[PDB]
């Protein structure tokens, strides 16, 4: 279900990986019995990093970043949004 996890920039970075569609796309898929446009997902986590300690799990699909709905967003949209934050990162993810 939806989970709002918070992670803080180490000077190393947030410490996972994000992977998802490059192009704009809205085709709906069934996830957990509900329909969603394509979602970016966590492709890797850094053991002993901010993401691992904070609670982000590999495979978690991202629904929001800093309260902004990224459902159906492009990879650059979410990445750029990730990098908009000064300090902190707030993610709403589905596990």
């Amino acid at each position: 279900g939806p989970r709002v996890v918070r992670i803080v920039k180490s000077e190393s970075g947030y410490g996972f990986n994000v992977r998802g569609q490059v192009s704009e796309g809205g085709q709906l898929r069934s996830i957990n019995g509900e329909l969603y446009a394509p979602l970016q997902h966590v492709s890797a986590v850094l053991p002993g990093g901010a993401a691992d300690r904070a609670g982000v799990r590999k495979g978690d699909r991202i629904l929001e970043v800093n309260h902004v709905n990224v459902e159906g967003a492009t990879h650059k949209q979410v990445v750029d949004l990730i990098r908009a934050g000064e300090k902190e990162l707030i993610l709403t993810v589905l596990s």
């Binding site: 970075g13 996972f16 992977r19 796309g25 085709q27 069934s30 492709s43 699909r61 990879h75």
Partner: protein
Amino acid sequence: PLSVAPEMDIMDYCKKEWRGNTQKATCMKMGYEEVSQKFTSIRRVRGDNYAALRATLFQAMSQAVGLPPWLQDPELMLLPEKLISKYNWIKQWKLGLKFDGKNEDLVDKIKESLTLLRKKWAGLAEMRTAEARQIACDELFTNEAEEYSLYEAVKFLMLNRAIELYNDKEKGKEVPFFSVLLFARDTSNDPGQLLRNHLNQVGHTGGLEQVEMFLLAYAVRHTIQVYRLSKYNTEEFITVYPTDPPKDWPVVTLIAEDDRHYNIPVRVCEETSL
């Protein structure tokens, strides 16, 4: 009844279709972890005798941003009459289970199938977005007479190419290696034997053989790149038809879990660390 099921994330497909840690499921999932480096999702292809043809055509047509020159070529629809007239044995053509006709009508049924292929491809190539094309293909691949008419067209194009390759071989021209293998089979020594004992049987007693994948690729001038999950950790894990693909041919990627179960990867991905 979509013959190509709707999109599903690879993460969800494996969670559902390849549960457990048996060596088989583990192998499939490590294979899908490779597919997952380039795509996020897959669509399951109907596992009938046309599976390889359906996966290839769905991918090629849903990626169509233009009408390929060999399909746009207006001389293409003269090919059925010119070939059947030159080679009357082609009238041993066996129709798919969804059609029937008397051999007099063979020429115009093939021309009808070729016209359908061209029209659908042109229609898809005119649409502005890839998502719009996939929806249009979804309406096309409903397992009805139109979808299966396309296979009659492609199969006829495969026969024509095989005829051209055989003729080149006998005249002494250079031919691609796969053609030697194709006609080296005791059941397919010549194009007629290829028609009666293999092409005619796709849709009735089996699907395309491995080396007929080359013929299909040459027939629609598409490079067919197949993730063969059963051959993970080997050179054949990713097999390509043709083995040396021309740089101008468009590429379609398939996933063959086994030789009868095909998925198509969709939604190209890219990864960023953070």
